[PDB]
Amino acid sequence: TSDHMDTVSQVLFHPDGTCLISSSFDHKIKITDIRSNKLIQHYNAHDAQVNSISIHPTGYFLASAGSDSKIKIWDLRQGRQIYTLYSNDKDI
C-alpha cells in the first residue's frame, strides 16, 4: 500500500523481470523495483471500476485498460501518457 486500494490487477514486469507494474481498482499504476521496492513514477490510470494492463514486449508501452471503456497508452521511455485513445467502446 506500492499504493493500491482493492483487488490488484495484472502485475507486469520490466523485460528483465524487474520494476514491476501494478494498479488495482485505484486509478494508478505504480512502477516499482524488486527488493529495492522503490517507485519511479505514478502512472495515473483510468477512473475505472477496475484497471487492466499488458506492456509492449520492449517494455516501452503501458497499455492501460480497465472496466470503463476509455483506453490509453503510456510511453515509458518518456513518462508521458502518449494520449487517450479514440477507444470507441472498449472496456478492455
Binding site: 477512473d47 475505472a48 470503463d68 471503456s69 476509455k70 487517450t84 479514440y86 477507444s87 470507441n88 467502446d89
Partner: protein, 354 residues
C-alpha cells in the same frame, strides 16, 4: 400594440437553399400541429412529435417516414450505429424500437420523472438518463444498468456524457456543477455556486473540454478544462433573454440554444458570443430543435406548424457572408454576436475539475 412577427429569422432562413422538401402535407395529418423535435445521434433518423405524440421519424432523402404507432411522445431520441432507436418517452420510460422498423424491442424503466433527458456516448457504449433526482448510466445495448447517481437533498437538474471521449458532468438545482467518475460513482470534481437554476441542463461536448449550463434564470455558464476552475466564468445574456430552456453542443465551438423568450440562438463558446439568431411569428412560434453535426442538418419544430427543412451549416452562410462583408469595413464580432462578458463571483457557477 405591440410585439414581433413574423418569420424573417426562421422560415426565411431555413428554407433558403434547399435541395428537397419536407412535404408537410404527408406528415401533419393530425388535427393539430407538430410540437416537438427529438433526434438521432446518427443524424438521419430525426423525428417529429405532434400534439398526438406519435413519433414520426422523418427520413430526409426518401421524403418518407417511420410512423411509430404508439402516441407517446419523446423527450429525446437515441439511436445506435447498428439500427436501433431508443425513445425517451415523456411517459417516464425509455422505449427502444428497431429504428429500422419502428418495432418495439425493449423498455428501460426505473425512473419516476417527467423528464428523461438523454445523451448517448457512441464511444463508450453508454447512455445516460437525466431524470427526477437521478442519473442512470447504462450499457447502450439497453438491457442492464451501470449506476444510479443521486443525492440526499439537492435535487438534480441535469448532466451528460462525453461522445468522443468520456467523463460525466452533473448538476443540482443549486447550480452546483460537478464531475463524476461515472464508473466509480465518485465525485472527483466539485462545485458550489451562487446561481441556483431551475430546469437547468448541461451540454457536454463530444470531447468534453467544454461544458454549458442553462436553466430558469437568464444566464449562461461556460466551462474550459484548460483553465481552473473548469467553470471559469459566467455571463448574462442578450437583452430580452429570460431563461434558457435548451442548450446543445455541435462540432465547431458552438451550441444551439432555446430560450423561454422562444428565440433560438447559436453560440460560439470560443468567445461566448451569439452567431445566429432565430425568430418566428407570434404564437404559432418556434418550439424545439435537432442539430445533426456534420452539416448541422436540422429538424425544427415550430409552433407555427412547419416542419423544417434546413442545415445550420448552410444558414451560417448568411452570418459568414454579411459578417465578412462587414469585415471589409472591419466590424467587431464581439458586438455582432454580442459577446457576453464574464461577470462577478456573485452569480457564477465556478467549478474546479480534473
Amino acid at each position: 400594440m405591440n410585439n414581433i412577427h413574423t418569420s424573417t429569422h426562421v422560415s426565411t432562413y431555413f428554407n433558403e437553399a434547399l435541395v428537397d422538401r419536407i412535404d408537410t402535407q404527408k406528415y401533419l395529418k393530425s388535427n393539430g400541429k407538430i410540437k416537438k423535435v427529438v433526434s438521432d445521434p446518427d443524424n438521419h433518423y430525426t423525428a417529429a412529435i405532434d400534439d398526438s405524440g406519435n413519433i414520426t421519424v422523418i427520413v430526409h432523402k426518401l421524403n418518407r417516414f417511420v410512423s411509430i404507432k404508439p402516441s407517446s411522445p419523446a423527450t429525446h431520441l437515441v439511436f445506435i450505429r447498428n439500427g436501433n432507436l431508443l425513445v425517451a418517452q415523456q411517459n417516464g420510460h425509455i422505449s427502444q424500437y428497431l429504428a429500422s422498423n419502428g418495432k418495439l424491442t425493449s423498455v428501460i424503466k426505473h425512473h419516476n420523472s417527467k423528464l428523461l433527458a438523454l445523451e448517448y456516448n457512441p464511444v463508450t457504449k453508454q447512455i445516460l438518463t437525466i431524470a427526477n433526482d437521478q442519473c442512470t448510466l447504462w450499457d447502450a445495448q439497453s438491457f442492464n444498468k451501470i449506476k444510479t447517481l443521486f443525492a440526499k437533498a439537492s435535487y438534480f437538474a441535469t448532466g451528460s456524457l462525453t461522445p468522443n471521449g468520456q467523463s460525466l458532468i452533473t448538476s443540482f438545482q443549486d447550480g452546483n456543477v460537478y464531475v463524476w467518475n461515472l464508473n466509480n460513482f465518485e465525485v472527483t470534481a466539485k462545485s458550489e455556486v451562487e446561481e441556483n437554476m431551475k430546469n437547468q441542463k448541461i451540454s457536454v461536448s463530444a470531447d468534453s473540454s467544454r461544458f454549458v449550463i442553462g436553466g430558469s434564470t437568464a444566464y449562461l455558464y461556460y466551462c474550459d478544462i484548460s483553465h481552473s476552475p473548469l467553470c471559469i466564468s459566467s455571463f448574462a445574456l442578450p437583452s430580452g433573454s429570460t431563461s434558457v430552456k435548451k442548450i446543445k453542443f455541435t462540432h465547431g465551438n458552438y451550441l444551439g440554444i432555446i430560450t423561454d423568450n422562444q428565440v433560438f440562438y447559436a453560440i460560439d463558446s470560443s468567445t461566448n458570443q451569439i452567431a445566429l439568431e432565430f425568430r418566428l411569428p407570434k404564437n404559432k412560434g418556434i418550439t424545439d430543435f435537432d442539430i445533426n453535426p456534420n452539416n448541422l442538418e436540422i429538424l425544427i419544430v415550430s409552433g407555427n406548424g412547419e416542419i423544417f427543412k434546413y442545415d445550420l451549416q448552410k444558414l451560417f452562410i448568411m452570418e459568414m457572408n454579411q459578417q465578412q462583408r462587414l469585415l471589409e469595413r472591419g466590424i467587431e464580432s464581439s458586438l455582432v454576436y454580442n459577446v457576453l462578458k464574464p461577470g462577478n463571483q456573485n452569480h457564477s457557477l465556478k467549478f474546479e475539475s480534473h
